[PDB]
Motif scaffolding. Structure first.
Motif, PDB file in Angstrom:
ATOM      1  N   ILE A   1       3.728  14.118 -18.126  1.00 22.44           N
ATOM      2  CA  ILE A   1       5.007  13.403 -18.090  1.00 22.44           C
ATOM      3  C   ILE A   1       5.773  13.785 -16.821  1.00 22.44           C
ATOM      4  N   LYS A   2       5.741  15.058 -16.402  1.00 23.04           N
ATOM      5  CA  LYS A   2       6.403  15.431 -15.152  1.00 23.04           C
ATOM      6  C   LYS A   2       5.785  14.716 -13.961  1.00 23.04           C
ATOM      7  N   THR A   3       4.447  14.561 -13.916  1.00 26.68           N
ATOM      8  CA  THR A   3       3.822  13.837 -12.822  1.00 26.68           C
ATOM      9  C   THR A   3       4.314  12.391 -12.791  1.00 26.68           C
ATOM     10  N   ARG A   4       4.455  11.768 -13.970  1.00 24.81           N
ATOM     11  CA  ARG A   4       4.920  10.393 -14.054  1.00 24.81           C
ATOM     12  C   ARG A   4       6.361  10.278 -13.527  1.00 24.81           C
ATOM     13  N   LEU A   5       7.219  11.248 -13.824  1.00 22.41           N
ATOM     14  CA  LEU A   5       8.589  11.165 -13.262  1.00 22.41           C
ATOM     15  C   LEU A   5       8.520  11.273 -11.720  1.00 22.41           C
ATOM     16  N   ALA A   6       7.644  12.149 -11.206  1.00 18.57           N
ATOM     17  CA  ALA A   6       7.529  12.293  -9.746  1.00 18.57           C
ATOM     18  C   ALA A   6       7.006  10.983  -9.128  1.00 18.57           C
ATOM     19  N   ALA A   7       6.139  10.267  -9.846  1.00 17.62           N
ATOM     20  CA  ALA A   7       5.580   8.990  -9.348  1.00 17.62           C
ATOM     21  C   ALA A   7       6.648   7.922  -9.316  1.00 17.62           C
ATOM     22  N   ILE A   8       7.509   7.865 -10.357  1.00 17.59           N
ATOM     23  CA  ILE A   8       8.611   6.904 -10.308  1.00 17.59           C
ATOM     24  C   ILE A   8       9.487   7.184  -9.073  1.00 17.59           C
ATOM     25  N   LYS A   9       9.804   8.465  -8.816  1.00 21.21           N
ATOM     26  CA  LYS A   9      10.643   8.842  -7.668  1.00 21.21           C
ATOM     27  C   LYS A   9       9.965   8.408  -6.359  1.00 21.21           C
ATOM     28  N   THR A  10       8.665   8.665  -6.189  1.00 20.43           N
ATOM     29  CA  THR A  10       8.002   8.227  -4.961  1.00 20.43           C
ATOM     30  C   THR A  10       8.081   6.733  -4.808  1.00 20.43           C
ATOM     31  N   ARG A  11       7.846   6.002  -5.891  1.00 25.86           N
ATOM     32  CA  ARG A  11       7.823   4.547  -5.820  1.00 25.86           C
ATOM     33  C   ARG A  11       9.192   3.926  -5.640  1.00 25.86           C
ATOM     34  N   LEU A  12      10.299   4.659  -5.819  1.00 24.71           N
ATOM     35  CA  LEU A  12      11.608   4.102  -5.418  1.00 24.71           C
ATOM     36  C   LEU A  12      11.613   3.794  -3.937  1.00 24.71           C
ATOM     37  N   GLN A  13      10.760   4.477  -3.144  1.00 23.15           N
ATOM     38  CA  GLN A  13      10.685   4.247  -1.694  1.00 23.15           C
ATOM     39  C   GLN A  13      10.050   2.892  -1.358  1.00 23.15           C
ATOM     40  N   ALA A  14       9.402   2.226  -2.322  1.00 22.18           N
ATOM     41  CA  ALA A  14       8.859   0.879  -2.064  1.00 22.18           C
ATOM     42  C   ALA A  14       9.958  -0.187  -2.208  1.00 22.18           C
ATOM     43  N   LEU A  15      11.160   0.177  -2.691  1.00 20.96           N
ATOM     44  CA  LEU A  15      12.234  -0.799  -2.930  1.00 20.96           C
ATOM     45  C   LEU A  15      13.220  -0.909  -1.767  1.00 20.96           C
ATOM     46  N   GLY A  16      13.706  -2.121  -1.532  1.00 14.53           N
ATOM     47  CA  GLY A  16      14.631  -2.389  -0.437  1.00 14.53           C
ATOM     48  C   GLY A  16      14.689  -3.845  -0.023  1.00 14.53           C
ATOM     49  N   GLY A  17      13.515  -4.465   0.086  1.00 14.00           N
ATOM     50  CA  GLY A  17      13.356  -5.855   0.500  1.00 14.00           C
ATOM     51  C   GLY A  17      14.062  -6.893  -0.352  1.00 14.00           C
ATOM     52  N   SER A  18      14.113  -6.689  -1.684  1.00 12.58           N
ATOM     53  CA  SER A  18      14.759  -7.659  -2.570  1.00 12.58           C
ATOM     54  C   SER A  18      15.072  -7.078  -3.966  1.00 12.58           C
TER      55      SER A  18
END
Ligand SMILES: [Cl-]
Ligand SMILES: [Zn+2]
Ligand SMILES: [Zn+2]
Length: 93
Positions: free
Chosen positions: A13-30
């Motif tokens: 579950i901790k790895t999954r929270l870290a993955a959500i945090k990394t993937r916030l970096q894919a957001l911005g375009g829309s």
């Protein structure tokens, strides 16, 4: 269940929270892309809440020591919910 197994699945579950945090970096375009991510984080909160319930049932077999793991899981769920709340707000301006 066992202490070792609950520590392993909490670490997952901790790895999954870290993955959500990394993937916030894919957001911005829309903004429209945030809906699916918010739904995914709500599913993660449900997954963690089910783990808190499983830990409480293990406590219910006479094992108070598991509270430490339940507290940690609930703190992760709170962090995930806080991230989802911020995406919802941004998507709607
Ligand atoms: Cl992922
Ligand atoms: Zn198992
Ligand atoms: Zn990506």
């Amino acid at each position: 269940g066992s202490w070792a197994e609950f520590k392993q699945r909490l670490a997952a579950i901790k790895t999954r929270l870290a993955a959500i945090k990394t993937r916030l970096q894919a957001l911005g375009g829309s903004e429209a892309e945030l809906a699916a991510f918010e739904k995914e984080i709500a599913a993660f909160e449900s997954e963690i809440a089910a783990f808190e319930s499983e830990l409480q049932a293990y406590k219910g077999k006479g094992n108070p020591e598991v509270e430490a793991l339940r507290k940690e899981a609930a703190a992760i769920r709170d962090e995930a919910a806080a991230i989802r709340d911020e995406l919802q707000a941004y998507r709607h301006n």
